[PDB]
């Protein structure tokens, strides 16, 4: 498994730098195993993509479970906790964030992986904290939704990293911006 | 002109590698050694600012073309503005990527910021009206633009990857940016 894990870390780095296009040969060389070993563990580029999205999401969920709390809590409290966890994770593990973002907006994630990934987070039970637009987006435009979220989260991380004196402000502003985006609803004449 | 070839090469270089892009290759790909480039622009900072302005002027041209002024809803106006911006980015990806890098650089003089405000006065007024104050402030204007350009680039990337649904992506992205960034009732 030692070998498989080194491969996952190498794929993370490769995709972080070059996206889904990253070569299987380069991943294997940067693991220090020939490309055949790689295709033994993962039988396809797709199977690897999916396994890596899940491995990375598990890593995220691990960093959170330390401070995980009960569902009877404000949806904004829970969502801010998730967002702060994510930002901390991306700052500590930039390649992990970059890779996972690439994976998320790939059109390559099986529904099985999507269900496993929902089930890493009991928290993804919307309970209409979301607006009507975004519940509609979750059905029809889920990748675009995640894309937008990760865009806001990455902008947050980049500014925090560039100017940590203001990190908390940025994390706050970014959070509110995504929260309004996710939660604010139509106001009519 | 020669200057224009330099600016277009600088756009391409920054689109690819950000502000770090070397003056040497910008000059090389313009077809001139570095001294010529430094003749036209005496600093990287001066070049950064001059290019931000050249690019914003291009954007402002492409937007002001399509504007009709009978419209007065601020969400209507901003939605058309965003359609124009998304169009420009789709048509000129290097120009968008570069302008985004330049915008969130901490390298833009206040003179450059006001000249660029004054390319589209109507958009600056639109923005003081509609945008939250934090994202408009002196201290967090850059973060606001960062968020905006993030959403705009995600919109562009999805539209480009899947043009059959481009309008859907442009609409949704707009709403997301609007709700995120703008003051409420």
Author numbering:
A (entry chain A): 7 to 195
B (entry chain B): 8 to 192
What does the paper say about this structure?
RamR is originally a transcriptional regulator from Salmonella typhimurium, which itself has no inherent catalytic function. We found that a closely positioned lysine residue is crucial for the catalytic activity of the designer enzyme by forming a hybrid catalytic dyad with the boronic acid residue.
A closer look into the hydrophobic pocket reveals multiple amino acid side chains in the vicinity of the boron residue, including a lysine residue at position 63. However, the lowest energy side chain rotamer in a sterically favorable conformation available to Lys63 allows the formation of a direct interaction between the side chain ε-amino group and the boronic acid of pBoF (Nε(Lys63) to B(pBoF59) distance of ∼4.0 Å). Based on the crystal structure, the boron enzyme is in an equilibrium between boronate and boronic acid under catalytic conditions, most likely shifted to the respective anionic boronate species. Based on these observations, we believe that the canonical amino acid Lys63 and the noncanonical amino acid pBoF59 residue may form a hybrid catalytic dyad, in which the lysine acts similarly to serine/lysine dyads during the hydrolytic reaction catalyzed by certain serine peptidases. Likely, Asp152 has an unproductive interaction with Lys63, and removal of this interaction leads to a large increase in catalyst activity.
